[PDB]
């Protein structure tokens, strides 16, 4: 269906959805529970980071024309905000500064002409997920490995818990995604910024995502690690992600 | 092998970490410790085993063979480890649970023949469980290199990861890739992308030729140890996805 190439930039900042236990803790999760039995684990909704997504409207086009995403510039925003060791963080030792945010993190983004397609996998299939979230349906023990029944569109912001969903590599013909998971108590967060780096979105045939209904989809999860309060309680900390996407007009048939 | 004359096959290969009961699928039984090398009978459900699949390909019949040219692969469920609210021991009082961390092994193989494997043991006197296929008539040389320990990955939940490694002395119709990272506190580092492809072609431009119109996929993805509230540790694994591009080749 895709014919000869026939330019625009779109910019976006996508805010994180870490749980937001109250206005003053926006960008944080609720304090983490621990040691629940697999058989009775009802996490509070505000405990669970979710994927961020947004649908950016493009100029109405019109042998039909479609917006083709060619490159993306993206970075995590506010990385330096973690140099505040004076407020809220538990002291590393007596008379010492506050504990830096550290621990398990996940850094992910996607650009596509359709909602990001996701596959469900659970640590614990018996986890009772909270009303308001969208999690694998009628899960079984097979849900703790690969169960092909758990397919979803990332079609709602602050809804799909990061812990239940991954990008589906068996789909996403019209999306490019990139993600890194680093797990552990003491993982140092490592984040780079530069306005000189670009990611090409073209495939092996030189075709970028083609925007269905003049709509561009951006998706992200940026869990930076755990924040430890004076009490010893722990909260996820997230940061927003910036996207700048270069598109061109592409001819397609019918 | 003559000149070239397209198909994709997709597969999810589930992990074989031991599965101590249905509710703990993807996990192993709690790890035992401090057993004497002279008296060690490990439980099968304690030992992660290699995952394998033979994908039947279209019947092609100066004969034509299926040639694997490219592979796209990633580990599935890497975000499942951000669950620190169930099963895990608190990192400290009032804190969340301990992230899955520790010794890990990440391997995949694509070939037109069963993956050929070599056996090395930490303890040759290990009494390995019935149901498992381990090095046969093991000697002290089995703790180093014993060329007698050759096998084919030819059964799932059978070949223990700790007893077998890919044979670099063989595997001419198989391309393999693995990384071992050992340690108590080793951070799991896993990447996901639909933009990465691995070429399976050799120095002559020939990829794995599928024998009996059959493509073999093999995997081992141990992500590290899950520390329960007890202090007990179990292995945790994730499935691996394969998308393999094949072409017709004259032979």
């Amino acid at each position: 269906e895709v014919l000869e190439v026939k330019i625009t930039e779109v910019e976006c900042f996508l805010n994180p959805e870490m749980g937001d236990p109250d206005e003053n803790l926006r960008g944080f999760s609720l304090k983490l529970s621990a040691e629940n039995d697999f058989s009775s684990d009802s996490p509070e909704r505000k405990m669970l980071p979710c994927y961020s997504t947004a649908r950016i409207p493009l100029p109405n086009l019109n042998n039909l024309l479609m917006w083709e995403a060619v490159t993306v510039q993206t970075e995590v925003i506010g990385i330096t905000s973690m140099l505040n060791l004076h407020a809220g963080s538990q002291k590393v030792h007596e008379h010492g500064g506050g504990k830096p945010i550290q621990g398990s993190n996940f850094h992910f983004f996607a650009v596509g002409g359709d909602p990001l397609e996701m596959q469900g996998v659970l640590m614990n299939y018996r986890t009772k997920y909270p009303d308001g979230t969208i999690t694998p349906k009628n899960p079984t023990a097979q849900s703790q490995v690969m169960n092909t029944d758990h397919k979803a569109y990332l079609d709602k912001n602050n809804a799909y818990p990061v812990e239940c969903w991954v990008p589906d590599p068996s789909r996403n013909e019209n999306t490019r995604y990139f993600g890194t998971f680093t797990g552990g108590e003491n993982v140092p967060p490592v984040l780079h910024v530069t306005n000189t780096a670009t990611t090409v979105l073209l495939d092996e045939q030189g075709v970028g995502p083609l925007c269905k209904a003049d709509s561009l989809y951006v998706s992200a999860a940026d869990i930076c690690g755990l924040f430890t309060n004076s009490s010893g309680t722990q909260q996820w900390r997230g940061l927003a992600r910036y996207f700048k996407i270069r598109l061109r007009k592409r001819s397609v048939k019918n | 092998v003559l000149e070239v004359k397209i198909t994709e096959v997709e597969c999810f290969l589930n992990p074989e970490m031991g599965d101590p009961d249905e509710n703990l699928r993807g996990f192993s039984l709690k790890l035992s410790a401090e057993n004497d090398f002279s008296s060690d009978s490990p439980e099968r459900k304690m030992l992660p085993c290699y995952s394998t699949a033979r994908i039947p390909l279209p019947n092609l019949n100066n004969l034509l063979m299926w040639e694997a040219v490219t592979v796209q692969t990633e580990v599935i469920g890497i975000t499942s480890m951000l669950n620190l609210h169930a099963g895990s021991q608190k990192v400290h009082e009032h804190g969340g649970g301990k992230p899955i961390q520790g010794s890990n092994f990440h391997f995949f193989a694509v070939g037109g023949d069963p993956l050929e494997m070599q056996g090395v043991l930490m303890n040759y006197r290990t009494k390995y469980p019935d149901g498992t296929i381990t090095p046969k008539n093991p000697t002290a040389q089995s703790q180093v290199m014993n060329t007698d320990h050759k096998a084919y990955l030819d059964k799932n939940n059978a070949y223990p990861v700790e007893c077998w490694v890919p044979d670099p002395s063989r595997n001419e119709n198989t391309r393999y890739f693995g990384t071992f990272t050992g340690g108590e506190n080793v951070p799991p580092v896993l990447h996901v992308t639909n933009t990465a492809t691995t070429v399976l072609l050799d120095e002559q431009g020939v990829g794995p030729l599928c024998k009996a119109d059959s493509l073999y996929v093999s995997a081992a993805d141990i992500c590290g140890l899950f520390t329960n509230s007890s202090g007990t540790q179990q292995w945790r694994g994730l499935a691996r996805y394969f998308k393999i591009r094949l072409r017709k080749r004259s032979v």
Partner: single-chain antibody
């Protein structure tokens, strides 16, 4: 040419002392030995798997060993509750009779499996037993029938794979018994035709551990209370 496991018929022990139950076999050290405790009119309990591994809920006093021609069950700090029958058991994947039980040792000091269809019948008659399994996805489990005739030991009768694809029977019942399974209903069947008096027994339903292919593993890790068939 079918494997033999020798157990001393009886052992006596004072409270607090140690009880040792031997299991003799030609090169049994080269095989995985499992142990079962059986109190009268109760489901057998697996207490040791693969020579020395204790299931969750079995006290540290219970220990297993296996070397050369002898496997050994050791019970230390013996209590009244330890008085029961004890059986060793092995599994040979490549054999005509692949599940071999021991002769038994009388020691003197969630998932549910429910059997039905037991009763009284004329010799030469027919009877179908059912096992309703609860709390497991049935096609992931090799299932087994094991019987105890009056004053005889546990006898392995029949085995079936999770898929329903691997039927195993003891010579005794070959061609008179058929084992079946309906994983939609999570039910195991034993069709007993041409019944004999030697078939009078309690029939126990025995689950093997979870397996991603429902393969035979050689382990009876959970049992039903049994059903009696008098003929």
């Amino acid at each position: 040419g079918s494997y033999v496991l020798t157990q001393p018929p009886s052992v006596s022990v004072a409270p607090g002392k140690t009880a040792r139950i031997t299991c003799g076999g030609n090169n049994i050290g080269s095989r995985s030995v499992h142990w079962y405790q059986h109190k009268p009119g109760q489901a057998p309990v697996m207490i040791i798997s693969y020579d020395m591994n204790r299931p969750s809920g079995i006290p540290e006093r219970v220990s297993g060993s296996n070397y050369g021609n002898t496997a050994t069950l050791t019970i230390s700090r013996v209590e009244a509750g330890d008085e029961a029958d004890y059986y060793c058991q092995v599994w040979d994947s490549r054999s005509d009779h692949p599940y071999v039980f021991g002769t038994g040792t009388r020691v003197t000091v969630e998932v549910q499996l429910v059997e039905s269809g037991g009763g009284l019948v004329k010799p030469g008659g027919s009877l179908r037993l059912s096992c309703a399994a609860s709390g497991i996805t049935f096609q992931y489990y090799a299932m087994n029938w094991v019987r105890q005739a009056p004053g005889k030991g546990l006898e392995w009768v029949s085995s079936i794979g999770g898929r329903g694809d691997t039927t195993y029977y003891t010579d005794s019942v070959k061609g008179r018994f058929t084992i079946s399974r309906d994983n939609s209903k999570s039910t195991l069947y034993l069709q007993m035709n041409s019944l004999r008096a030697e078939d009078t027994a309690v029939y126990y339903c025995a689950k093997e551990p979870f397996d991603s292919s429902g393969d035979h593993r050689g382990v009876f890790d959970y049992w039903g209370q049994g059903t009696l068939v008098t003929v």
